Design a protein around this ligand. Structure first.
Ligand SMILES: *S(=O)(=O)C(C)(C)C(=O)NCc1cn(Cc2ccc(Cl)cc2)nn1
Ligand code: NA
Length: 240
């Protein structure tokens, strides 16, 4: 997250860190959202490389023991069957990870609330991106979870020629684009939390940013629109 602020420890308890094994240790690669005690929602592109993954829930500072983390293996990966790693712009950038064990819920570990199927946010709706991704274009990961206020940019604006054009689809949510605040590498897979009827719900899964930089005017961060996939999510959970 570029242009973010450090999140309070208990603010976003559904946020997870998706990590892969690197030598004798682990490296953060993506965010995700805990949606059941044994299921995480992330981006399909986060699992394009065949690596050993783990999920960390209750995480705040990646480099330090917070006394709140639970570490769990990934037992099954279900990518959307229409996902094409060579065509991110086509959409379908969503995957479900079945965890090897059910995590325990507490003030630091809670299920993310998903939107009602079909919900589309009005332009300029209030949302926050969270993650440990880069804090500057070409920079380094955040040590502590960051948040940034990223109001939505509706489809008509986002898919217009001076924004993303045809690359953005109606199955995506755009947010931000103010040139200062944005998602960045390593936020992918994580949530966009949007305030609807007084409750925050996870309306986006971070999918891509501009090749030209993370915080670029009129290149808002682009997210998979969770409300386009409610039936798919429920079908996966019920059949696995
Ligand atoms: S996201 O918008 O943050 C973005 C820019 C697409 C991103 O940085 N995604 C992170 C990501 C994760 N993976 C899979 C991967 C590749 C290589 C290695 Cl060593 C581990 C994991 N690809 N992009
Ligand atoms: Na920690």
């Amino acid at each position: 997250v570029v242009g973010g602020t450090e999140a309070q420890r208990n603010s976003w308890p559904s946020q997870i860190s998706l990590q892969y094994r690197s030598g004798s240790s682990w490296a953060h690669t993506c965010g995700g959202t805990l949606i059941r005690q044994n299921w995480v929602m992330t981006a399909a592109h986060c699992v394009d490389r065949e690596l050993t993954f783990r999920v960390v829930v209750g995480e705040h500072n990646l480099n330090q023991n917070d006394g709140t983390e639970q570490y769990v293996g990934v037992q099954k990966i279900v990518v959307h069957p229409y996902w094409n790693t060579d065509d991110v712009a086509a959409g379908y950038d969503i995957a479900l990870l079945r965890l090897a064990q059910s995590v325990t819920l507490n003030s630091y570990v809670q299920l993310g609330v998903l939107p009602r199927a079909g919900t589309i946010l009005a332009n300029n709706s209030p949302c926050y991106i969270t993650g440990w991704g880069l804090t500057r274009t070409n920079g380094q990961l955040a040590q502590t979870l960051q948040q940034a206020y990223l109001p939505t940019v509706d489809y008509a604006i986002c898919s217009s020629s001076s924004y993303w054009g045809s690359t953005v689809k109606n199955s995506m949510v755009c947010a931000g684009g103010d040139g200062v605040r944005s998602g960045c590498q390593g936020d992918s897979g994580g949530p966009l939390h949007c305030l609807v009827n007084g409750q925050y719900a996870v309306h986006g899964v971070t999918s891509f940013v501009s090749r030209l930089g993370c915080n670029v005017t009129r290149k808002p961060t682009v997210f998979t629109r969770v409300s386009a996939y409610i039936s798919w999510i429920n079908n996966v959970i019920a059949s696995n």
